Amino acid sequence: GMTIQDYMLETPVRMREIISNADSLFNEVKRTNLKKIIITGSGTSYHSGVQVQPYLQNLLDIDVVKMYPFMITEDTFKFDNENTLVVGVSQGGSSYSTYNAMKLAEDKGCKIASMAGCKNALIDEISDYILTVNCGEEKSGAKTKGYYCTKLNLMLLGLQIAREKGIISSEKYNEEINKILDAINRFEAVYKLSKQWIERNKEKLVNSKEIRIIGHSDIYGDTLEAALKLLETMRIPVTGYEFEEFIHGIYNAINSDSTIFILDTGKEPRVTKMIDVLSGWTENVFAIGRDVTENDKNLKIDITDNPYYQTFNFIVPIQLICGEIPTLRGVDPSVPKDTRFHMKL
Amino acid sequence: GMTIQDYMLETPVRMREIISNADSLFNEVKRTNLKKIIITGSGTSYHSGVQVQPYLQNLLDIDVVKMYPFMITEDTFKFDNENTLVVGVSQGGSSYSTYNAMKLAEDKGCKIASMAGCKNALIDEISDYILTVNCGEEKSGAKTKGYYCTKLNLMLLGLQIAREKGIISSEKYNEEINKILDAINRFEAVYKLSKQWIERNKEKLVNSKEIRIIGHSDIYGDTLEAALKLLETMRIPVTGYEFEEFIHGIYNAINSDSTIFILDTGKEPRVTKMIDVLSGWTENVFAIGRDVTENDKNLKIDITDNPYYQTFNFIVPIQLICGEIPTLRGVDPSVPKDTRFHMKL
Amino acid sequence: GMTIQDYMLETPVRMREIISNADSLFNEVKRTNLKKIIITGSGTSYHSGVQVQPYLQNLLDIDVVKMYPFMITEDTFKFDNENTLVVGVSQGGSSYSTYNAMKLAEDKGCKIASMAGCKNALIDEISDYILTVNCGEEKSGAKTKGYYCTKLNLMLLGLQIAREKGIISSEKYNEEINKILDAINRFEAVYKLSKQWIERNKEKLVNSKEIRIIGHSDIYGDTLEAALKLLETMRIPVTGYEFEEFIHGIYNAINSDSTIFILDTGKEPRVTKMIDVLSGWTENVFAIGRDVTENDKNLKIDITDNPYYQTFNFIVPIQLICGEIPTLRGVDPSVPKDTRFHMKLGSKKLN
Amino acid sequence: GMTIQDYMLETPVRMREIISNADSLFNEVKRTNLKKIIITGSGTSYHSGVQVQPYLQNLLDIDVVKMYPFMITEDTFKFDNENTLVVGVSQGGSSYSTYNAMKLAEDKGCKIASMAGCKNALIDEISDYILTVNCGEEKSGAKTKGYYCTKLNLMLLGLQIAREKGIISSEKYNEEINKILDAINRFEAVYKLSKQWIERNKEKLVNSKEIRIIGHSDIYGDTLEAALKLLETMRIPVTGYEFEEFIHGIYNAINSDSTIFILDTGKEPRVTKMIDVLSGWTENVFAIGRDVTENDKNLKIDITDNPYYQTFNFIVPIQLICGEIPTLRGVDPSVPKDTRFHMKLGSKKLN
Lengths: 345, 345, 351, 351
Description:
The structure is a homotetramer.
Chain A: H1 4-9, H2 11-25, E1 36-40, H3 43-59, E2 63-67, E3 84-90, H4 96-107, E4 111-116, E5 129-130, H5 145-164, H6 170-185, H7 187-200, H8 202-206, E6 210-215, H9 220-234, E7 238-242, H10 243-247, E8 258-264, H11 271-279, E9 284-289, E10 299-300, H12 316-324, H13 341-344
Parallel strand pairs in A: 1-2, 1-3, 3-4, 4-5, 6-7, 6-8, 8-9, 9-10
Helix pairs in contact in A: 2-5, 2-6, 3-5, 3-9, 7-12, 9-12
Keywords (chains C, D): Isomerase, Repeat
Domain SIS (chains C, D): 25-167
InterPro entries (chains C, D): GlmS/AgaS_SIS, GlmS/FrlB_SIS, SIS_dom, SIS_dom_sf
């Protein structure tokens, strides 16, 4: 069967085709009168909204919010709703959580868009703008390709609107696309170095008992996604945290059996002190970034320095762990623990 | 020294005095011209905003949002900011994360309020409205009292504004205060039943290896807080989840060593099926609520049925676990792992 | 069968209830016109007045004085006493001494208030304001809970008057309630440390022959109360003294069989020298406080710096001694020596 | 020293590169005026045309035909051929047969395009459009990568023309690229399952005496290519047949020493009966497809239902046999029998 690795390796070409299809895909939605955007989805789809919302709030002149579908209630839609676009994100396209939140928004007068990873998605039937993430089929439970492609599609929605409404010129739009292409171009080199790093640290990774990931606020969504994917495939406790929030009590639970991944974006001068203190408690601290100290446990990757587009390179190493290490712990990472779990609920 | 239990047991009288002081405390802030409220704080303070924001969005006619301090950037303050009230929440009153977010809001023209648990808090120096949570000193790392008192203070801010602006009449304000008092009045009975339940399940609780808490969206903030406090005191992996989000992949990591607390608010008809499926994988599933099946592992507590004010009773059992069980696992739950951790960072 | 320890442990719950009921209980009395307050009662009731009078004198704008009932006479009321409130304090509510003093006060035109620990108290009969101390029943001859709840009740009276009359703002009232709550919340922690200290010093305490307690003026009433409760339960000579007064001759009677408890509030720089001099005469010196030296005999407890609210914690250790040590000396400390002593003497004439 | 397997495994990366470079590569040719397309080449190049011609005929509005170079003559161009594009296909880029056919076409006024697997190909010399198949060098006599990348290149030509001329929308172009990408992404998974199937059937495969492949018409070009590559590497008789044509007399030559590979696309309801009849004559029947019966001899691979894009997966197993089994039969399958065969015969006259 197709593997997580297969899907990661085709991600660059899918992203380039998505960029090429953007003028056609967003030609209608860019022309709407918008005063607010709400991005909503469950699990990995929620993470794409968490990750890209800061970029969009920086780019656009309207409020851009992300919300779990459970947070969407009638109280979310008290004000003007005619100029609110609700973007429902679901790669499989049939999550009832997301469908239900979109249906409530529709009943309240909102404009509705869908971002599913297939044509004829369930969520498309209640959508005004079918903004398909054209990443192709991904028949693995641990989606990787789809995550990257969905974040990209959300950014292109922003750029397309920004250019149409005059926020950015045609040239600035092109400059940003070029920066995105620069990030995509680094994917395979990051993948290769990650594979080598995983091999060097194979024994400790295979013995992982519980994992925590510490990231910068600029990659908070990716930090949550890395955690969820490790949880689903390693099948042990895994949680993602922003650096400052980790300082607020999480250190209390660290012991010699703890594994910690530090996603170092270079914006936090206390990272070295954190690595030291944690290394005093566990031997399983691994740092990932452009300027980490080179030693066996660390992965030095030349990630684009743009704080937004680094999202297209940073968690590749963690996603490769999900594809490689579970197979050494008696698990096929693309098949869930219980295929009938959803049917049972 | 003072214990978590000591602080929980005085929570009712502190809440009643807070209610009594509200007309005086909120007399100035209720008179401001407000178009938006942002509640921000770290860790437990963030959880009070997560928990109460739905109540406030239901009550008021303006947008009410909660945000981690790391999410607050210059892009948060693009629009009109003169009518935006930023409420910085910090029980100790000196968290730099929260102070920094408030300072950025102040520099951008926002109205600033503080909700600290002491007079002369660091955050009060940059505040226009010092809205002290008058809960008294709490010299434990695992705050309980302060959490309840802060959520209460946030609700009273809402009621005080609502009444002044004509959203609710004087009588409706009184009706809501009465409902809050009804919730406070149930605290000791919930505490007593919780203590008995903990004693009955002592062996399994003491042997906890990793815990997950599953809650309803109406108690999502409390679900996160229960998780953080167990983490800090039990010193093992602990994560809180909303029910629907748990269905999106978290079940994959459940095994025979997993402990699961289900906070059953009675609004989810699939809870019984969830308990069954999980019970098939682990013997450590404990359900808490008004109508749970009575058996040794479950705690049936007559929580107020109001979906907002249930916040004053629901997690008492979990907070009592934090006070009692760590002492059987070689830990003083009021003292952190490393008293010098913050000084080291 | 409730013990002294049971009643001590109940005290924080009752105190919090009293605080929550204060707006109701004091709603009428706070509205009266007052130019003087006299607090009067016998024994432990007297001590509650001794202890809280300073707080009240500091808080209010009218003279607040405390007096033994035998001191109350027609000469106490020579000029206009229409604005004088006599607060009679009696936990059982039927002390004739106290009843008689109140009765004379009202004859001279004073307003009368009662603070009994039961409903339908004899003293309520002649009272304009029934300011019941709602601490519940206390079937112990050695009252503890009732002492704390009566001191609290007196403080609340002050606070309620102060707010009504404008001496303090509503927020200042709230702040003071919260400080009192901060003292009440330390009670259990102090009790636990007290129990460990007693166990560590068990032998010397069981062997007690005669005791003296030396306190700071801020806790003079509590010093007198601690001494009376030890006397009643240990059944040996026990006397309490303020620090300065002890210097005025009491040292002459100290010998190697003397036991001394020093309640060190941290405001007296001569305490170290006092301890050193006395420790040269007796091995039975026990210091209690926030910053006491490391010695098995000393009890380090972290009590508020507030000179008034420390009253809710300081003597907990001594009351615990009253509950625990007499049981090792052939006494049930909750039962007096002679249950018919008052009957044998007879009562004084009820006016 | 790159093997057939190395070149097969490189194929998805090269195909994705070609797809991303399509807008650049086909930008000029898509703009020409075309009324007919003739695709011509020898051997594997011929097969690429046989395989993709149906797709192209379905996609475009002009006749698309494929022809062996020997079939191209002056009679091929009797009327106005200004709008006829001859696409010469040659991976090495120097087949005289192909070069000569292109040369005559242009003499009659046709537009000329080349599809060589190297830069500066002999055939590029007379080409108006150098539509290089950018698959990289393939130093194997048994080409695999180049076959897949040439078929893709031909499909892209079609898609690029179709979009430019308005037959398909921009989104429809994008959708078709994504379907092709969906086939390309299954290549590795199919390779892995193929390798296991070969290992399981190793003995029968090593003992192969003569082989016939039976395919559906949708994969007729791939059936012919599979047969030629087995012939070149296994060095025994090998012939490929469409299903219906096999029924027209080929069954007469089947005996117990015959090996038969059935490429089952799921569109032929008689396949089960075919397998049953043939399995009665030989134990060497191997069926390959999405819904094949459970037998060690069968290879179940989940290939798209799309009759055109399945071409990127179906013959992977057969090419893998070409790389692996000849090594167990004394042959390096990447080196021909006689490296100087073409030299010994000589070339035909280059026009």
